[PDB]
Amino acid sequence: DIREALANGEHLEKILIMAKYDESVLKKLIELLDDDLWTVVKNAISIIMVIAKTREDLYEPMLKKLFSLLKKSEAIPLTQEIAKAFGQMAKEKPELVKSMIPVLFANYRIGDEKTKINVSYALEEIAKANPMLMASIVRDFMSMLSSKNREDKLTALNFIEAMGENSFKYVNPFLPRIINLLHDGDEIVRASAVEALVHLATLNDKLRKVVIKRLEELNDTSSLVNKTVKEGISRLLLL
Known part of the structure; x- marks a missing residue:
């Protein structure tokens, strides 16, 4: 029983060889991505992703489903496996990653800690799998900072709050562009610019004192911003 073997991590190579030869198994494993049991989802991914290296058409549908799964995953091994799968498409299908990451950030709710x-x-x-792809994707979002539309700046901003230690050197050259949105006329964008700057300060000690100083200096009309400035002032001081 394919499903129960996935749940106990057994027979995996078996299942892979079967899925790789009998399409109706491949389809089964895809369908088991929706299972409530994480170990099942996890081991389905790792199998489908090996089958993908010889079947190009599996990448695109799988990327879409990974986006949903990052919303759904609560088990850290599943999270890990999801992230490794992203890494593998970044080396083998860079354009697909390039063209869909903005889709994720523009479409999906990414404003709860878990997500x-x-x-x-x-x-x-x-970022570790394809430094070049990464710099390139960062540039696509930093272009969204100038946009007129409110949503597109918040999408850029959501992206910047998901930056880490290895993508930090890509965003560092864009700072002024990001600080620039502290002068935006829409209060909601100002506050998100703050959160995003707050989050980047936690990655780099020098930037942290710049941001600190800056946010102190700031006095605003929105309460919805003044609060944001004050909370974030509080976090950065700790470190």
């Missing part, structure tokens, strides 16, 4: 962490792991794995 945030799950998403960070995947971008850290894209």
